[PDB]
Amino acid sequence: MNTVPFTSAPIEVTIGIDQYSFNVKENQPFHGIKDIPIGHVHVIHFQHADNSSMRYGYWFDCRMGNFYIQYDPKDGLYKMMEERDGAKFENIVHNFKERQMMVSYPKIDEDDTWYNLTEFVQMDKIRKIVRKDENQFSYVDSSMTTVQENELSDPAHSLNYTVINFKSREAIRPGHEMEDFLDKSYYLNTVMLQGIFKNSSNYFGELQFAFLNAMFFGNYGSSLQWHAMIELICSSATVPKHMLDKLDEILYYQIKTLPEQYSDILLNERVWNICLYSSFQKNSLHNTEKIMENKYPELL
């Protein structure tokens, strides 16, 4: 179990750690988060009390270094940093744990939620979507745009998700226009899975990361990406059976975890009704269809 020490909490802020969140008052004696489970990526995220504008945060993996948060009064945000001096860090953490200045990552033992939301998400793939190679952790916020969004403006600050576009030469084989547009199996299995992602685990990892950025930061381009990746599978007549069974599990936990009051903006009515009721896989997402129908019957 690892620890992320805060230098201080000079501004009132709601802090999120994965799916948990807590309020910290201006200048409250808060010095970080302990007992963070090893073996998973994590996200620590922030919303200032004075400016709910800009949710922002950092994706990290404590196996890749010792990381802490210190407020920057010039740029006006909580920044993640790496501490290269190992004995300095250990001494920092042990003192704050002794003074009980840290909140405990509050995982319930029966609870697999975070594992189920991040099963295929790897830090190395996050760092290729979010390019800032001098750091081991990745910054994301509500306003960052995606590569595909830029085509339709600062490249350094973009989310480099895999571009999916159903009306594109990559998606449509010359001479198979109707076939490839109505059955996207070619595009899913050959172009994306065999060609670009290499395997379905990398595909699911990007889908999961896109959902998490949509949910935690209200990142609109990430929501677009999540839905596009769902639609590409559902619109394929030919999908490996293990992929469909895993997709159903993935989506089920995403829908389970979604705030009930955010479903109006985070869920695209057209994609979901198509996927669950019109698509080739309309009968292949039993768990997802049952939770959607019992929790968001309005959308449908």
């Binding site: 009306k167 594109s168 030469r169 449509i172 226009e177 109707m178 547009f181």
Partner: protein, 237 residues
């Protein structure tokens, strides 16, 4: 964007454009089987592809053999239309290819767009106008060439005959749309108007009678009466 009453003069500017109508591509007669069930028998159809500025009509005849052994024919018809339009554009010299293609039914947008991915600078547009191009199979010479076809065939016409020697393309299009609206609302009456007088002939190389300017005004007036009436006979007014 969508083509409507507001931007109607754009049809007659000097940017090449084509209307594409798919109504008559997949055509059937519905009949009873010996067992008393219902079945369809397809008949020949056509893609109606029209340059509204010049009157040039590219009439691609769709022979019933193209449906043999195929499923979901109404859906296939839209993709077949898009494939043929795409093939037509690729056959034209660059300086004759359209800058816009306007489809008369919105269901043609995605099929044409996918077939034209190679042509990103050709705009595919819908329209809000209720254009009466389905009634092209009420024009006798056009119907005749479609029904007689024994194989796929493209036939080229000028749907304005020689009108552009005397009127503008705006006026020619308005005449065409009025004639076709009339034929669509009451074919028999419309056809009576156009040839009940036996001294006005259709030239061998034309589609419509050789009316003088004054006879066209009379004719056009008779067609508007027909359309207004039928709109009464229909709605009782």
């Amino acid at each position: 964007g969508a083509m409507n009453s507001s931007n109607y003069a754009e049809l007659f500017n000097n940017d090449i454009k084509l209307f594409v109508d798919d109504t008559n591509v997949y055509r059937v007669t519905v009949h009873k089987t010996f067992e008393g069930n219902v079945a369809t028998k397809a008949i020949n159809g056509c893609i109606f592809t029209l340059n509204p500025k010049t009157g040039h009509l590219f009439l691609k005849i769709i022979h019933t053999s193209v449906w043999a052994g195929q499923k979901r024919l109404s859906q296939l018809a839209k993709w077949k239309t898009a494939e043929e339009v795409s093939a037509l554009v690729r056959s034209l010299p660059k300086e004759e290819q359209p800058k816009q293609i306007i489809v008369t039914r919105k269901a043609m947008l995605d099929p044409l767009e996918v077939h034209m991915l190679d042509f990103p600078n050709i705009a595919i547009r819908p329209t809000e106008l209720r254009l009466p191009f389905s009634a092209a199979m009420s024009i006798d010479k056009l119907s005749d060439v479609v029904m007689k076809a024994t194989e796929p065939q493209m036939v080229l016409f000028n749907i304005y005959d020689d009108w552009l020697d005397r009127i503008s393309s705006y006026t020619a299009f308005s005449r065409l749309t009025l004639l076709l609206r009339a034929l669509k609302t009451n074919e028999e009456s419309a056809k009576m108007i156009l040839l009940s007088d036996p001294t006005i002939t259709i030239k061998s190389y034309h589609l419509w009678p050789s009316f003088t300017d004054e006879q066209w005004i009379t004719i056009e007036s008779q067609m508007r009466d027909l359309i207004l009436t039928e709109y009464g006979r229909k709605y009782n007014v």
